[PDB]
Amino acid sequence: VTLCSPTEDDWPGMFLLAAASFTDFIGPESATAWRTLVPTDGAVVVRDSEVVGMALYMDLRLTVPGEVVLPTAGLSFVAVAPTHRRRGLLRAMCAELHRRIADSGYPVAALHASEGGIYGRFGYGPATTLHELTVDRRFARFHADAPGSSVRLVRPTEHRGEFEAIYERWRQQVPGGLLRPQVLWDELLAEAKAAPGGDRESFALLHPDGYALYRVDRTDLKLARVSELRAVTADAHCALWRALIGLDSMERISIITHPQDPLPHLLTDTRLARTTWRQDGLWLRIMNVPAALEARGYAHEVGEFSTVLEVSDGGRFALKIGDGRARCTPTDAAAEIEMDRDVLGSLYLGAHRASTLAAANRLRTKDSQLLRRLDAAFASDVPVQTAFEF
Amino acid sequence: VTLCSPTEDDWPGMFLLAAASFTDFIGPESATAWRTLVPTDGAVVVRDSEVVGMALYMDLRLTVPGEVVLPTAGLSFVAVAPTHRRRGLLRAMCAELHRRIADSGYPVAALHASEGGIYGRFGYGPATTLHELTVDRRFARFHADAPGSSVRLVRPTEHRGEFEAIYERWRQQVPGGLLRPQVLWDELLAEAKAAPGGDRESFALLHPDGYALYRVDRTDLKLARVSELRAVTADAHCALWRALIGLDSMERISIITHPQDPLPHLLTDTRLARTTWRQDGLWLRIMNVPAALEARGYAHEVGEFSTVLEVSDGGRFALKIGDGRARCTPTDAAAEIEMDRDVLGSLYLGAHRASTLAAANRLRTKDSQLLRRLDAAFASDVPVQTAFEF
Amino acid sequence: VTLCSPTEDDWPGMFLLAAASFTDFIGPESATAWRTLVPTDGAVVVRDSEVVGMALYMDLRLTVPGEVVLPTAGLSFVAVAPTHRRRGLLRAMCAELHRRIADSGYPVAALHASEGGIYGRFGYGPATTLHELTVDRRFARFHADAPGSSVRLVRPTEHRGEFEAIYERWRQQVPGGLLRPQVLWDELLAEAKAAPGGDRESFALLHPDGYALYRVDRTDLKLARVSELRAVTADAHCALWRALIGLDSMERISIITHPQDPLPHLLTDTRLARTTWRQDGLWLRIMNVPAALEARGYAHEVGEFSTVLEVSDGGRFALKIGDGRARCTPTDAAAEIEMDRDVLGSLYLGAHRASTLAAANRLRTKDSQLLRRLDAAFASDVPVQTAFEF
Amino acid sequence: VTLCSPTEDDWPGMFLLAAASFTDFIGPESATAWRTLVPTDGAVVVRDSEVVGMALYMDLRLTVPGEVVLPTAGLSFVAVAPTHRRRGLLRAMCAELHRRIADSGYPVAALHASEGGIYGRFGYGPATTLHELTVDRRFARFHADAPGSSVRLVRPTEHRGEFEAIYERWRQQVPGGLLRPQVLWDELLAEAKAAPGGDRESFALLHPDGYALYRVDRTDLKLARVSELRAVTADAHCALWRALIGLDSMERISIITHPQDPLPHLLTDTRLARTTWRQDGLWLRIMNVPAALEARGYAHEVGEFSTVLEVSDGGRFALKIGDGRARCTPTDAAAEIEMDRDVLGSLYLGAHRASTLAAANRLRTKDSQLLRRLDAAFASDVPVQTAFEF
Amino acid sequence: VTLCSPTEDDWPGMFLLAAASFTDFIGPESATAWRTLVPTDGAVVVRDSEVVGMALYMDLRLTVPGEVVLPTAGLSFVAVAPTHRRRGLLRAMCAELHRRIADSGYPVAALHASEGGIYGRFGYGPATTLHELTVDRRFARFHADAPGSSVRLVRPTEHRGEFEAIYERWRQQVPGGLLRPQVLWDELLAEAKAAPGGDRESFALLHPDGYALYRVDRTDLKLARVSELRAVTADAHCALWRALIGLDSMERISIITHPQDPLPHLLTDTRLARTTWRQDGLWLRIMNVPAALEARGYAHEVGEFSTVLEVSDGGRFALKIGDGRARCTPTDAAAEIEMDRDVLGSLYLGAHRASTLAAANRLRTKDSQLLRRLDAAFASDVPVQTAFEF
Numbered sequence A, B, C, D, E: 001v002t003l004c005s006p007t008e009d010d011w012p013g014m015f016l017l018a019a020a021s022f023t024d025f026i027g028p029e030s031a032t033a034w035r036t037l038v039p040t041d042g043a044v045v046v047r048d049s050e051v052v053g054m055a056l057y058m059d060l061r062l063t064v065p066g067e068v069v070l071p072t073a074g075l076s077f078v079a080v081a082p083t084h085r086r087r088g089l090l091r092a093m094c095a096e097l098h099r100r101i102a103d104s105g106y107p108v109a110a111l112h113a114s115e116g117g118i119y120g121r122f123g124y125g126p127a128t129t130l131h132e133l134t135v136d137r138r139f140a141r142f143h144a145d146a147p148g149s150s151v152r153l154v155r156p157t158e159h160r161g162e163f164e165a166i167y168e169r170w171r172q173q174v175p176g177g178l179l180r181p182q183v184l185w186d187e188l189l190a191e192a193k194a195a196p197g198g199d200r201e202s203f204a205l206l207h208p209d210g211y212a213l214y215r216v217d218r219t220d221l222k223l224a225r226v227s228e229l230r231a232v233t234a235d236a237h238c239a240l241w242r243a244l245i246g247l248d249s250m251e252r253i254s255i256i257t258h259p260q261d262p263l264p265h266l267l268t269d270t271r272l273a274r275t276t277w278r279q280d281g282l283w284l285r286i287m288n289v290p291a292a293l294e295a296r297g298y299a300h301e302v303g304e305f306s307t308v309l310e311v312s313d314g315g316r317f318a319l320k321i322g323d324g325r326a327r328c329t330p331t332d333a334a335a336e337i338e339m340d341r342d343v344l345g346s347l348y349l350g351a352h353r354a355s356t357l358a359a360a361n362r363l364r365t366k367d368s369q370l371l372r373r374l375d376a377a378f379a380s381d382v383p384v385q386t387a388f389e390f
């Protein structure tokens, strides 16, 4: 077995392994669109002859707290043949790509995890939380205090520009926001079309400062699934939910959102917005600890403090945080905080509290005051969301 | 119809309405135990003759942030006869009890809500969050970093003192903690016994600094239900979960816990701790805004700030927060923050962020800096939990 | 094998066959109560030694159209041992009991059928229709036109006399009404008590002119099952349904009622009263055609007409109907209407239209005018209901 | 918002609202076929610009008791945008169409209801009853008395003329019968073809005097669904059911039929024809009370009687019924019967008994004899059925 | 009704009856491929005009114990119109085909049974056993002793020759093996392609001495269905299962195999290979008892013995078995063993033990030693499998 950058002659074998490995395989045509986001030397294959291993990264732009956009290496299309399990092919491919990603100058790498138990050992920590809400809309009444017709029912393919403009503003402002390039808008509006023996037609609700794409479930005809809701203002978010609660032929609206979604609070009965499902969203590997920690903004509310952070096999740093900025410098001084790289990725967008990871002993300190200060500093003012799966 | 304090001759009619209104009716004997927690003039009945309305409060002790214990009026046994719906009996009973609770000097009232849509209009806001985790324990492996035999499998009825001592420490420290009096320990250890055609026998796992009570589900014989886990140290919490993952005849362990429960982080696969259910726990009505706001501790990390808070039909106050303390004084100055009483109850233990209620417009301010400061000040260092249903 | 009246020494063997044959076996004690309704020579057993066959009838009083009460032989406790199937024991027992019932002077016999395919060949026709309604009471609003507190939530065991008085009036007026004797009231109010690992406690709703007994389902705790609703006036029927829709802790009320139950029409949305189940109720065998046909009242609206009815192996009769009365005399004149005895039982209480049985060719005539006249004459002004299972 | 007759430029916006409002949207092509049944000025739209409201009626021919065919306005394609709920758009569209329908000279309007709670307030009463029977055909044996090869298994597209001739006879004779025009036969035989990832191929059973179209369920491969069975004679109805019980690879045959369907009576076990579902079918609004009441035949069996009927905000009439005919004349005399327009629609085809609506107080009289006379007069000799959904 | 060989003008009517009779109808095109396996005079139709009955046989080659290949008449496409049940059409068609099959010189006929109760009376006995195993592959670990990359994940359409070569070796050696002709390979690799709204794409696992075709289930996306696994060596069978347990995105692998499949024994936990389903596979009718009994090999382990076998209405034979060969000669001597033809078919491939059929009295002897000798002689060294459905 040998690991190397694939040739144009290797892609047919990679599409075969993809088809066999991913039930949601977008297909060779759709796969060729995403491929435009893979840089030269962004892919590795293992050959036995035939492709038994593959992995690649895409050039992404990720918004982190303080509205800072980081170049981000998005790992995807990671697959080992069922014939070559337990031969260390994933370890070899991840090591080679991480070397390339580091050398290329990416401060962070990211992925969506097929299973929860794989990526921790390679330094990835779950950094966003997906939260399905199901609304029994038959009972939903808006609170007297709820804002709000500004919303239009439209065909998605006829309003691409308005969606792109809204999404662009949304992402420049929401931790977890990813730049969505033209090819991914092409793929999005193609999935909006009804499929024979497949998904039903998608509709859009369009506000000047928000949109929702939804479709009726293929099997449950009383369930509407919101595939995407992007609102830049509270007014837009409320107006869009008023329109969705107005789908009078539906019993239930389901959406995959984030834990801080205000929808429950718009209703007289908060319990009507049931949390039916929760899962890790985006995973982060901090490739360069000082660059990552210096790049993001921190809470202005916490006062200036200094400490020494050790990342296991990742460096030891003098960390000074004040005025919502951090300085992270090399030091041999005694560490006051110790954690694995994955734990740092989990703190980085503010989705997990340092005191919660401390309680599990994923994060060790002898100063409870230092823990409270970390919790407060790494908190995100704007709640962290999940842009789109890759 | 007339509203008045019940006589000993009214309780038989109240037990009848209870039996008809609550499927989980503890029964007259168990009801007589809880009754020892109802003060003189703690109960109202509506008579037509027969009892068609009832409501009472219990004398409770609730822990709020900064380990402060407030006398708390716990509303319970609230029932209107199915024959007397839509006649304003709940409004009349709640008004009479609130008058008594206020006059008696309780700064806060609390309840568990049979439905999510009733209690908001009477000034109650959901203040804690219940979070069911289900662990597929067949796959659960502890992380290298997880602490840890210190734990003993014991019969609950033979270790009441150790449970009472652990629970007492736990509650003096956890926002949401309630003093559990002797009669409620009597009722707890009676529900620990197996019932003919009912619940199976309960076992306990006992650590010096923690316990878990669990029982196999009556129908699903591969499901263990943890009725209660109280751990005062992280070591205890980990040691108890090691023992529960050691129930090798079970497929699944389920527990009703809080959103900050560190269990997911103790495992190599965080996803094995699935969130199967989420709901409002304790509801709070702030009876006296200045007394409540001055009583709790605030985050030391936020710097001193001053604002003017208006509660709708509940006063306007000069609110100064610094050194983790608040001063709340009467003022006629322009309000910078406005909200209904229920919203204040929802912020009070730190389970809901002011910026999330602001996004739903349940909380109005024109200062984004003031919002960030409120979020940070009302945050609880120790995560808010739910002691026990009443 | 021999067929004979059982001895007191045969009843232990009959209780064994009962226990093995009927999963709902009331038990020997409850069986001894019903036994007080079996006349001397009301029972047959088949012995091989051991009881392998049994059948009995009870002395009942059945209300038929025109508020006429007929002495009725109620067949019950009919069982053949699983060891003696396909040996003609049911045919032999039914023949012997029918001989006794005829000789004793009963104009009609009745039963509830364990299966739909057995009793037709012995001359029994399904004569009432059970109709389960399930109400999603969360959506139920009463119509502006609906009548209507007159209703009290009460303990069943404390209001036996009021229930007995209401039921007695109800039955003297409703085709299908049965006299309920004291022993069956004893058994009814014993099933009202909660059972360990069994049914939950029963409540009653009591109006001067109606009652409902209901209990929450043992498994579905959001379902209330109405075991019995007897209303003598429309006001009572509406008032009782207002109270049942007021069970605010329930999602669904289910009742076994009749097809003409006005409940759907009391609601703004008739569709909320879903028909979840339909089945044959009481079966009738007309033992004496002339006595049965002369005993019941007929519709005053149909004008006087005469015809010749032949029952297959049951006689031929000159049938004259006018002024809501019939004269049925022996004749050898050509038959204008022909049908089997079971078909007559199915027409007798007015639950099945002659034109519907004609369409299936269970009833043969060459006169369409005669068919319309039969339909109209045998119609019941008061809708036919089902009193209680025996 | 403005209400007006749509332009050819408004139909694209109407198809969008249709697609979003009706999951069963036939599609623009199929929608263009039905459109040939909409008269000039048969449609209204509400514009904000974009279509947010629409409603139309089709020119139909409805058979009522006495084989009388009424011109009927069939409301369909009624939709309000989810963005414009609770703005009175349905009330405004229904008022405008009713004005047009009345002025145009239609004595009655009709619809199929998406929900049971909408159309009562606009004067529509449910007038037919859908009744699903499911037969476990493995146990089904025909009764000795059942009639009856006359039936051929055929391809539907090769026998359109025979189906059209049978349906035409059926409808000229069955209350609820609708003329089915050529475009609806085009649409019917297009739904008979198998769809990729959709419905399976349809077969027909053809008798000289009846047909059945059936198809195996897409998911349950042991269930046959009869989409349509039209039989003009009892022989045809029996012969077709013999053939359907002969589908030996099926466990269950399901059909949507009417409550008087004789199928149960053709079997030795009536219980094998289970009622699995019941719902309102066609709804009627009597546009002109005297014209409607004079147009239908009445039962010859009831003797001549006279009364005064008041319809709430719909007139008061001297109503004389005799010789199966009615005369309905204006009067200011005291009303003996009072009811809302919807109630009249529910009585009109004979599916609901006046005494049942009286019991719910939807229909008020102080004469019980008058009630019995109404019940008997409005009864339909031929049972009321449901032709096809529009 | 008349029975005769179909004309080219009868096949359209046969495709109609096929479509109506078989939900799995391959379709006219696929049906035309299989048709190439039907000899001249291999088909009968019954005409009323229209086809109401059909049946045909295909020329097959069946492997029986001792690696002997018998010409085999494979009955298929057997259908009676639902309009012509209970008229003896199946009896008439089976009698005509059996006459032709016998005259043509086939020693055995075979079929797959749509139901278990039809074919016994026509002399067919179930001769193979289908056994579904479902593996929870998340827990599956191979035993230290298990053999074993030799296996390649490949596209089925690119490796037809290798599959054909492996299948050919497999079938020349496995009792139940059928020659698979080119047209059936054409049909197999066409079902390997993904279908719109139908089955997902098929993958293959290819070893020098084995293959598996599998596809993910259309509904359960965590279930892989192995459509076919053919392994000529134990190494191949183990290597293929190692690869299938390596489908890490699946929870469950299901396969239809035989009762002696060694898979359970390859795992440390035999219980992980759950038997979820069992059914009769191939049915045999011995057309010529002496030819069939002399053709197969017998166990060398049993010593030479002689007996007299009577088949009910099928002959009496002197049966001598020794050196794994049988001589079967006509005799009028007293029968020592008696059985129906179907029972012989059930013994013939060694799937059913003579002592088990004796215990049910399907096989009568007064010699227990003779029974043990039959059991041992008819046993198959190589376990009997099921090639493919026809």
Ligand SMILES: Fc1cccc(N/N=C/c2ccc(Cl)cc2)c1
Pocket: A024, A026, A031, A032, A034, A035, A038, A056, A058, A076, A077, A389, A390
């Ligand atoms: F050839 C390439 C290059 C990059 C990514 C891919 N795969 N596409 C990724 C992806 C992941 C999840 C979804 Cl929902 C949809 C798409 C293929």
Ligand SMILES: Fc1cccc(N/N=C/c2ccc(Cl)cc2)c1
Pocket: B024, B026, B031, B032, B034, B035, B038, B056, B058, B076, B077, B389, B390
């Ligand atoms: F008479 C009284 C006085 C106070 C409370 C009560 N009811 N008990 C409350 C309660 C609530 C929930 C549970 Cl799980 C268990 C118990 C009855």
Ligand SMILES: Fc1cccc(N/N=C/c2ccc(Cl)cc2)c1
Pocket: C024, C026, C031, C032, C034, C035, C038, C056, C058, C076, C077, C389, C390
């Ligand atoms: F010994 C006897 C004499 C008469 C009837 C019986 N059985 N009781 C009948 C019965 C039938 C149905 C129900 Cl729900 C409840 C009870 C036993």
Ligand SMILES: Fc1cccc(N/N=C/c2ccc(Cl)cc2)c1
Pocket: D024, D026, D031, D032, D034, D035, D038, D056, D058, D076, D077, D389, D390
């Ligand atoms: F443009 C128009 C004009 C008239 C009716 C329609 N919609 N078609 C009605 C309809 C209703 C139910 C079914 Cl199953 C099938 C079809 C569209």
Ligand SMILES: Fc1cccc(N/N=C/c2ccc(Cl)cc2)c1
Pocket: E024, E026, E031, E032, E034, E035, E038, E056, E058, E076, E077, E389, E390
């Ligand atoms: F015209 C003919 C001639 C012979 C057989 C057939 N039918 N094909 C048989 C068959 C049986 C089962 C399956 Cl899975 C697949 C196919 C049609």
